[PDB]
């Protein structure tokens, strides 16, 4: 377009190019008014930079529209807050960076909305966010990461970030960890930051008084809070969050406490006056409407409309004879059910859970305690095989590790697929590194000590088909914020976290834009073990819509006599405790007699997954070949049908 020029008031990017994403158009004006009006005062289109809009899927176009609407007070007028509550894997970083880049450079009045943004992030994901900026918009913008270093070296970085003048601001995007942010937010007070993005912001429950104070100190007008689950189901745990996001129309913290919080709690009190019960609930409903107004949530099933078929398989693996004997012997000696009860407690039940989880992963992780003769492993060293060591890992000694071994071995000879290995535990990854060396698989491990540059490098090497690396292993805490391992076709989620959002995030590293193959996710669980109980509590949290909890293995006052007993049980007979607990009406004597509902997919309850107790009806030859004594049961499902 030549009707553009250098030195005319115009939208930063042509609002009429084929696939433009127009976030704003100027209001209609009458011909008469237009002619008299001064041309340097007319609103201008806001149009997403083509560099980014060329690359956004439909849902992503909708997301940026939603964000931009919210954050500029066009959705809820007088409020500048937004809760982004998409399922993991729909590219939250891309939508956000698009938001940022739009706000940094454009507004209806034809100048930037904001001058600087702060992204608050888990420590493990800080570097991922930084890389995500580089990946999407190249040399155009320079982000800055702050995460640890000297208390004074951090202060310097922050001071440099804030004291930046007008027009050309070399460092307009800051990414700090929550840890450093909460300890340093005084620097940010009155420092004119336009936007905050609190990532993984569901960790900001009412008791996190540090972060909210720090967040208040900063006082950025427009606020995007990201969360795994929707909030409204468990609203009472999220007053602060709701208020931070919506303070534009909720008023002061004290005003909000007075109108909403105090009445709501007053009515919920076990002796409220019926009139009081009614008043509070009414206020809760008002609050729910506000959250509804400002929250966006899309689920991962919409990816199936342009990605290859994904196949998810939860695999129940039988504990080794050895593992069982250790497990039994631990329970018998530790007596974790009879170690802490009426009053609170969580000291020695945390550690007994911790030990059993290690045990399920591999006895080797438990071996050190057997040498000590520490409480719960007396004479356990006698159970270990005739001749054993540290250096060589023996995958047969563990159910899950065996199946892992099998999958990798089958995958390597049957396909030319690459594999992502995920574990919640460093020491488990250390065993994977040993396995790989012994099996002669080449691999890369995403550390956490890894520099920003080296992090970008190894990912790009891995996604290249020319690369010789077979396995990419990472710890799930690092498996988010746009990390994309598209070169890999299959992913093994080795062990379950208490929070379902964490597993979900890490699993979503492979079935993403640009994937060219059918994907296979594997979740390994040890049959009749705490692991099934973990996957069960995950399900329970998701089922009750919201339910975010970082605490679980910590403060164990939310279980009780019988439910605890269950947590520390061993079922040696079941094919899957998870399945038993369904009381499935679709399976008869190990055969699946009726299929799941027609339109059910990977986003469904395990009760609507395919249940499989014989290696019959699997859609993954690698898994089938891997099914021996080690596998007792498989839940499986798929994104959609390949036919397309
Ligand atoms: Zn069934």
UniProtKB/Swiss-Prot annotation:
Keyword hit for Glycosyltransferase: no
Keyword set, alphabetical order: ATP-binding, Helicase, Hydrolase, Nucleotide-binding, Phosphoprotein
UniProt-listed SMART domains: DEXDc, HELICc
Gene Ontology biological process terms from the UniProt entry: double-strand break repair via synthesis-dependent strand annealing; reciprocal meiotic recombination
Post-translational modification note: Phosphorylated. Phosphorylations at Ser-475 and Ser-476 allow efficient removal of RAD51 filaments from DNA.
Extent of motif DEAH box: 199-202
Molecular-function annotations in GO: ATP binding; ATP-dependent activity, acting on DNA; DNA binding; DNA translocase activity; helicase activity; hydrolase activity
Signal peptide: none
Function of the molecule: Plays an essential role in homologous recombination (HR) which is a major pathway for repairing DNA double-strand breaks (DSBs), single-stranded DNA (ssDNA) gaps, and stalled or collapsed replication forks. Acts as a molecular motor during the homology search and guides RAD51 ssDNA along a donor dsDNA thereby changing the homology search from the diffusion-based mechanism to a motor-guided mechanism. Also plays an essential role in RAD51-mediated synaptic complex formation which consists of three strands encased in a protein filament formed once homology is recognized.
Assembly and binders: Homohexamer. Interacts with RAD51.
Protein name: DNA repair and recombination protein RAD54-like
Gene: rad54l
């Amino acid at each position: 377009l030549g009707l553009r020029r250098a030195g005319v008031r115009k939208a930063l990017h042509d609002p009429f190019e084929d696939g433009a994403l127009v976030l704003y158009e100027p209001p209609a004006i009458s011909a008469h008014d237009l002619i008299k009006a001064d041309k340097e005062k007319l609103p201008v289109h806001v149009v997403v930079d083509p560099v980014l809009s060329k690359v956004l899927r439909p849902h992503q176009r909708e997301g940026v529209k939603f964000l931009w609407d919210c954050v500029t007070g066009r959705r809820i007028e007088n409020s500048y807050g937004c809760i982004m509550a998409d399922e993991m894997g729909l590219g939250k970083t891309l939508q956000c960076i698009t938001l940022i880049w739009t706000l940094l450079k454009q507004s209806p009045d034809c100048k930037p909305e904001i001058d600087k943004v702060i992204v608050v992030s888990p420590s493990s994901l800080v570097r991922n966010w930084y890389n995500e900026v580089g990946k999407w918009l190249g040399g155009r913008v320079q982000p800055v990461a702050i995460d640890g270093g000297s208390k004074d070296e951090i202060d310097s970085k922050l001071v440099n970030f804030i004291s930046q003048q007008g027009m050309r601001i070399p460092t307009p995007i800051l990414i700090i960890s929550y840890e450093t942010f909460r300890l340093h937010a005084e620097v940010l007070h009155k420092g004119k930051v336009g936007l905050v993005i609190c990532d993984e912001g569901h960790r900001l429950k009412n008791s996190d008084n540090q972060t909210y104070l720090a967040l208040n100190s900063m006082n950025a007008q427009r606020r995007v809070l990201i969360s795994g689950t929707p909030i409204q189901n468990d609203l009472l745990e999220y007053f602060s969050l709701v208020h931070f996001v919506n303070s534009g129309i909720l008023g002061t913290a004290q005003e909000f406490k007075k109108r909403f919080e105090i009445p709501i709690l007053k009515g919920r009190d076990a002796d409220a006056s019926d009139k009081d019960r009614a008043a509070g609930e009414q206020k809760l409903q008002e609050l729910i409407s506000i959250v509804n107004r400002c929250l966006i949530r899309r689920t991962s099933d919409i990816l199936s409309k342009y990605l290859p078929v994904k196949i998810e398989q939860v695999v129940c693996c039988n504990l080794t004879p050895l593992q069982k004997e250790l497990y039994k012997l631990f329970l018998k000696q530790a007596k974790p059910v009879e170690s802490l009860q009426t009053g609170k407690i969580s000291v020695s039940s945390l550690s007994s859970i911790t030990s059993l989880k290690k045990l399920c992963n591999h006895p080797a992780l438990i071996y050190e305690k057997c040498l000590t003769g520490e409480e719960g492993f007396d004479g356990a060293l006698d159970l270990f095989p005739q001749n054993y060591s540290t250096k060589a890992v023996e995958p047969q000694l563990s159910g899950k590790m065996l199946v892992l071994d099998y999958i990798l071995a089958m995958t390597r000879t049957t396909t030319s697929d690459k594999v992502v290995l995920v574990s919640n535990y460093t020491q488990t990854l250390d065993l994977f590194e040993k396995l790989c060396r012994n099996r002669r698989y080449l691999y890369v491990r995403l550390d956490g000590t890894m520099s920003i540059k080296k992090r970008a490098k190894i990912v790009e090497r891995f996604n290249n088909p020319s690369s010789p690396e077979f396995i990419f292993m990472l710890s799930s805490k690092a498996g988010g914020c746009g990390l994309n391992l598209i070169g890999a076709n299959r992913l093994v989620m080795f062990d379950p976290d208490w929070n379902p959002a964490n597993d979900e995030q890490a699993m979503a590293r492979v079935w993403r834009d640009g994937q060219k193959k059918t994907c296979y996710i594997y979740r390994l669980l040890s049959t009749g073990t705490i692991e099934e109980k973990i996957l069960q509590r995950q399900a329970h949290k998701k089922a009750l819509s919201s339910c975010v909890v970082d605490e679980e293995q910590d403060v164990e006052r939310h279980f009780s006599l019988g439910e605890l007993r269950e947590l520390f049980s061993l079922n040696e007979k079941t094919l899957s405790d998870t399945h038993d607990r369904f009381r499935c009406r679709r399976c008869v004597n190990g055969r699946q007699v009726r299929p799941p509902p027609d339109d059910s997919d990977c986003t469904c309850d395990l009760s609507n997954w395919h249940h499989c107790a014989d290696k019959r009806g699997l859609r993954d030859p690698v898994l089938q070949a891997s099914w021996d004594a080690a596998v007792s049961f498989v839940f499986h499902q798929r994104s959609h049908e390949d036919q397309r």
